[PDB]
Design an enzyme around this catalytic site. Structure first.
Site, PDB file in Angstrom:
ATOM      1  CG  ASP A  30      -2.512   0.433  16.790  1.00 54.54           C
ATOM      2  OD1 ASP A  30      -1.892  -0.575  16.320  1.00 54.54           O
ATOM      3  OD2 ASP A  30      -3.605   0.857  16.321  1.00 54.54           O
ATOM      4  N   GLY A  39       2.082   6.063   9.476  1.00 55.35           N
ATOM      5  CA  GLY A  39       3.467   6.444   9.170  1.00 55.35           C
ATOM      6  C   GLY A  39       4.473   5.340   9.504  1.00 55.35           C
ATOM      7  CB  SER A  65       2.595   1.911   6.396  1.00 58.36           C
ATOM      8  OG  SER A  65       1.253   2.164   6.767  1.00 58.36           O
ATOM      9  N   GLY A  66       4.625  -0.610   6.668  1.00 57.41           N
ATOM     10  CA  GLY A  66       5.727  -1.282   5.994  1.00 57.41           C
ATOM     11  C   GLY A  66       6.814  -1.720   6.943  1.00 57.41           C
ATOM     12  CG  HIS A  91      -0.575   0.395   2.469  1.00 56.25           C
ATOM     13  ND1 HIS A  91      -0.187  -0.551   3.394  1.00 56.25           N
ATOM     14  CD2 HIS A  91      -0.425   1.622   3.007  1.00 56.25           C
ATOM     15  CE1 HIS A  91       0.165   0.129   4.472  1.00 56.25           C
ATOM     16  NE2 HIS A  91       0.046   1.439   4.277  1.00 56.25           N
ATOM     17  CG  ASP A 119      -0.323  -3.825   2.738  1.00 52.15           C
ATOM     18  OD1 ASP A 119       0.278  -3.374   1.719  1.00 52.15           O
ATOM     19  OD2 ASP A 119      -0.638  -3.122   3.710  1.00 52.15           O
TER      20      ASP A 119
HETATM   21  C1  LIG Z   1      -4.120  -0.583   3.757  1.00 55.35           C
HETATM   22  C2  LIG Z   1      -4.620   0.548   4.624  1.00 55.35           C
HETATM   23  C3  LIG Z   1      -3.683   1.360   5.258  1.00 55.35           C
HETATM   24  C4  LIG Z   1      -4.059   2.351   6.159  1.00 55.35           C
HETATM   25  C5  LIG Z   1      -5.409   2.510   6.439  1.00 55.35           C
HETATM   26  C6  LIG Z   1      -6.360   1.733   5.801  1.00 55.35           C
HETATM   27  C7  LIG Z   1      -5.987   0.761   4.873  1.00 55.35           C
HETATM   28  C8  LIG Z   1      -7.065   0.017   4.079  1.00 55.35           C
HETATM   29  C9  LIG Z   1      -8.294  -0.349   4.920  1.00 55.35           C
HETATM   30  C10 LIG Z   1      -7.518   0.800   2.821  1.00 55.35           C
HETATM   31  O1  LIG Z   1      -6.375   1.057   1.962  1.00 55.35           O
HETATM   32  C11 LIG Z   1      -5.781   2.262   2.069  1.00 55.35           C
HETATM   33  O2  LIG Z   1      -6.215   3.181   2.723  1.00 55.35           O
HETATM   34  N1  LIG Z   1      -4.601   2.254   1.405  1.00 55.35           N
HETATM   35  C12 LIG Z   1      -3.608   3.266   1.462  1.00 55.35           C
HETATM   36  C13 LIG Z   1      -2.914   3.627   0.316  1.00 55.35           C
HETATM   37  C14 LIG Z   1      -2.022   4.663   0.409  1.00 55.35           C
HETATM   38  F1  LIG Z   1      -1.288   4.992  -0.677  1.00 55.35           F
HETATM   39  C15 LIG Z   1      -1.791   5.389   1.573  1.00 55.35           C
HETATM   40  O3  LIG Z   1      -0.979   6.485   1.568  1.00 55.35           O
HETATM   41  C16 LIG Z   1      -2.483   5.017   2.729  1.00 55.35           C
HETATM   42  C17 LIG Z   1      -3.376   3.944   2.656  1.00 55.35           C
HETATM   43  C18 LIG Z   1      -2.301   5.787   4.016  1.00 55.35           C
HETATM   44  N2  LIG Z   1      -2.934   5.135   5.191  1.00 55.35           N
HETATM   45  C19 LIG Z   1      -4.205   5.695   5.644  1.00 55.35           C
HETATM   46  C20 LIG Z   1      -2.327   4.054   5.730  1.00 55.35           C
HETATM   47  O4  LIG Z   1      -1.264   3.658   5.306  1.00 55.35           O
HETATM   48  C21 LIG Z   1      -3.005   3.253   6.793  1.00 55.35           C
HETATM   49  N3  LIG Z   1      -2.003   2.501   7.521  1.00 55.35           N
HETATM   50  C22 LIG Z   1      -2.163   1.996   8.817  1.00 55.35           C
HETATM   51  C23 LIG Z   1      -1.209   1.113   9.314  1.00 55.35           C
HETATM   52  C24 LIG Z   1      -1.317   0.591  10.563  1.00 55.35           C
HETATM   53  C25 LIG Z   1      -2.388   0.952  11.426  1.00 55.35           C
HETATM   54  C26 LIG Z   1      -2.559   0.463  12.779  1.00 55.35           C
HETATM   55  N4  LIG Z   1      -1.693  -0.423  13.323  1.00 55.35           N
HETATM   56  N5  LIG Z   1      -3.633   0.887  13.575  1.00 55.35           N
HETATM   57  C27 LIG Z   1      -4.515   1.755  13.049  1.00 55.35           C
HETATM   58  C28 LIG Z   1      -4.429   2.266  11.786  1.00 55.35           C
HETATM   59  C29 LIG Z   1      -3.361   1.871  10.935  1.00 55.35           C
HETATM   60  C30 LIG Z   1      -3.235   2.362   9.612  1.00 55.35           C
END
Ligand SMILES: Cc1cc2ccc1[C@@H](C)COC(=O)Nc1cc(F)c(O)c(c1)CN(C)C(=O)[C@@H]2Nc1ccc2c(N)nccc2c1
Ligand SMILES: [Ca+2]
Lengths: 55, 254
Positions: free
Chosen positions: B186, B190, B192-193, B41, B90
């Protein structure tokens, strides 16, 4: 054998015919004569923290 | 990372910082001198693949101390089953253009074998999650690398301990929950990855990737991590492959 307590291996476990078990090690480690322990063969083996290891 | 502590400099030496045009993008995990494991992602919105940099030996973002090593990312490998904007599969495998040099501050985390990961590591309760992510929900990101110890949950238990909310994505067999439901601790967007690292008989292993959740440290919700054990064979095969022209590579999964 590998399913229970990792077959006694420190790292990887391979099951063999009957009750035969072989432990193995990630790259940068060698298996000791005990057949279970793994010892580093390189300066920076994976998953080890040098500042804590050197302390 | 919410509710953790500063990772003392050199204690998370496998932690990678990913930058796009010098801006903070994501975290990653160095698994040998050439390869990094991150989340798919992270790359959903990349337009210029040439401005993607991986930094190893990073600790404090406000100062250069000489332990940092920057490398251009020559390849970003994502499974064909990953769909942008969604949760499943992911994971990304990144090839550095030039290897990093291992030092006291740059060391790979062990990518375990699938058997070992499923039958042994999956039962180690606590693991470390790290990154320079948000210190609070709707708060500023960290300047120093943060680390947090989280317990792993069985997927039935994650679903029974979670607050009943609509339109919520399912937790597949390519994921696992970890953390707390009381809103205190948690990993965040930021982070992520970043690695979810598990200690076993004196060595650390890669078990998860910071993936998703709903709002950082939200009451009734746990963090969701990519189940790295499902991808060992997929990663090992790719690491034996020759580089291909173009940065982005979609590879068949399984
Ligand atoms: C895959 C993903 C990723 C996130 C949020 C939602 C989703 C899915 C449902 C939809 O998919 C997305 O929202 N994808 C996506 C694509 C992008 F390019 C982004 O910049 C972004 C997300 C930014 N963002 C909100 C993210 O990274 C966020 N990460 C976390 C990582 C770890 C988390 C944790 N432990 N507790 C709470 C929240 C958390 C959010
Ligand atoms: Ca620095």
């Amino acid at each position: 054998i590998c399913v229970n307590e990792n077959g006694g291996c420190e790292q990887y476990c391979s099951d063999h015919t009957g009750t035969k078990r072989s432990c193995r090690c990630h790259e940068g480690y060698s298996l000791l004569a005990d057949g279970v322990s793994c010892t580093p063969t390189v300066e920076y083996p994976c998953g080890k923290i040098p500042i804590l290891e050197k302390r | 990372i919410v509710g953790g502590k500063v990772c003392p400099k050199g204690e998370c030496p496998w932690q990678v910082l990913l930058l796009v045009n010098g801006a903070q993008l994501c975290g990653g995990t160095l698994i040998n001198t050439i390869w990094v494991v991150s989340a798919a992602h992270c790359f959903d919105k990349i337009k210029n693949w040439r401005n993607l940099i991986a930094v190893l030996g990073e600790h404090d973002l406000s100062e250069h101390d000489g332990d940092e090593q920057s490398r251009r990312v020559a390849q970003v490998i994502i499974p064909s089953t990953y769909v942008p904007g969604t949760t499943n599969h992911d994971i990304a495998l990144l090839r550095l253009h030039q290897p990093v040099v291992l030092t006291d501050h740059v060391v790979p985390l062990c990518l375990p074998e699938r058997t070992f990961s499923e039958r042994t590591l999956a039962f180690v309760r606590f693991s470390l999650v790290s990154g320079w992510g948000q210190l609070l929900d709707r708060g500023a990101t960290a300047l120093e690398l943060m680390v947090l110890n989280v317990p792993r949950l069985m997927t039935q238990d994650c679903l029974q301990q979670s607050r009943k909310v609509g339109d919520s994505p399912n937790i597949t067999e390519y994921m696992f929950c970890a953390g707390y439901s009381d809103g205190s601790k948690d990993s965040c967007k930021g982070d992520s990855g970043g690695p979810h690292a598990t200690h076993y008989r004196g060595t650390w292993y890669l078990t998860g990737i910071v993936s998703w959740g709903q709002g950082c440290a939200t009451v009734g919700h746990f963090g969701v991590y990519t189940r790295v054990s499902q991808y060992i064979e997929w990663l090992q095969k790719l690491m034996r492959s020759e580089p291909r022209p173009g940065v982005l590579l979609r590879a068949p999964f399984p």
